[PDB]
Design an enzyme around this catalytic site. Sequence first.
Site, mmCIF file in Angstrom:
data_model
loop_
_atom_site.group_PDB
_atom_site.id
_atom_site.type_symbol
_atom_site.label_atom_id
_atom_site.label_comp_id
_atom_site.label_asym_id
_atom_site.label_seq_id
_atom_site.Cartn_x
_atom_site.Cartn_y
_atom_site.Cartn_z
ATOM 1 N N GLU A 32 -1.750 0.451 -6.433
ATOM 2 C CA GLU A 32 -2.373 0.081 -5.142
ATOM 3 C C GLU A 32 -2.716 -1.412 -5.136
ATOM 4 O OE1 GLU A 32 -2.378 1.570 -2.417
ATOM 5 O OE2 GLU A 32 -2.194 3.719 -2.798
ATOM 6 N N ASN A 47 -1.436 -2.812 7.122
ATOM 7 C CA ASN A 47 -0.581 -1.623 7.360
ATOM 8 C C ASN A 47 0.160 -1.801 8.691
ATOM 9 O OD1 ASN A 47 -1.579 -0.297 4.973
ATOM 10 N ND2 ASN A 47 -3.435 0.181 6.139
ATOM 11 N N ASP A 72 0.240 0.125 11.213
ATOM 12 C CA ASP A 72 -0.523 0.660 12.372
ATOM 13 C C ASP A 72 -1.632 -0.320 12.790
ATOM 14 O OD1 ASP A 72 -2.474 1.086 10.451
ATOM 15 O OD2 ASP A 72 -2.590 3.270 10.752
ATOM 16 N N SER A 98 -4.200 -1.290 10.874
ATOM 17 C CA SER A 98 -5.295 -1.130 9.900
ATOM 18 C C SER A 98 -4.968 -2.015 8.696
ATOM 19 C CB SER A 98 -5.485 0.314 9.540
ATOM 20 O OG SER A 98 -4.402 0.783 8.774
ATOM 21 N N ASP A 135 -5.726 -2.172 4.217
ATOM 22 C CA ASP A 135 -6.173 -1.550 2.957
ATOM 23 C C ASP A 135 -6.971 -2.556 2.127
ATOM 24 O OD1 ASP A 135 -4.811 0.813 3.650
ATOM 25 O OD2 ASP A 135 -3.276 0.563 2.075
ATOM 26 N N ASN A 158 -8.491 2.391 3.418
ATOM 27 C CA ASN A 158 -7.916 2.024 4.725
ATOM 28 C C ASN A 158 -9.007 1.934 5.812
ATOM 29 O OD1 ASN A 158 -7.502 4.240 6.892
ATOM 30 N ND2 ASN A 158 -6.121 2.500 7.231
#
Length: 129
Positions: free
Chosen positions: A35, A46, A48, A50, A52, A59
């Site tokens: 990650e 991301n 969409d 959003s 992380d 998220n």
Amino acid sequence: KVFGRCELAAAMKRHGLDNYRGYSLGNWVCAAKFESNFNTQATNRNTDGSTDYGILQINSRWWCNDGRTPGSRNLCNIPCSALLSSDITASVNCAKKIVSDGNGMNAWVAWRNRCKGTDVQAWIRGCRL
Ligand code: NA
Ligand SMILES: [Os+3]
């Protein structure tokens, strides 16, 4: 802060992630490697809209407020910046809510794609735990 592998294993164990919801410590260390590369300051956008955040790439769609993710939730009741501290406490507390939500560790795409079904205990081998 860029954690050492065994340094992070020890911090995650101290916070009670070893066998949390049945996930052995190596699952959590493997997830953090893929990650964030063990970097508490890691941030990644991301598709969409959003983002992380932190060592476990939590998220803003569901878990934290970053002020720029419309129609999202803040189910860990935290600013996303709290997830970037050298102290992993907020990330761990939020990760316990995530892994308890019904998805288990499938909530982390990197865990599903790079850790699930592998020898995850390799991520804690050599460590004094
Ligand atoms: Na949010
Ligand atoms: Os153990």
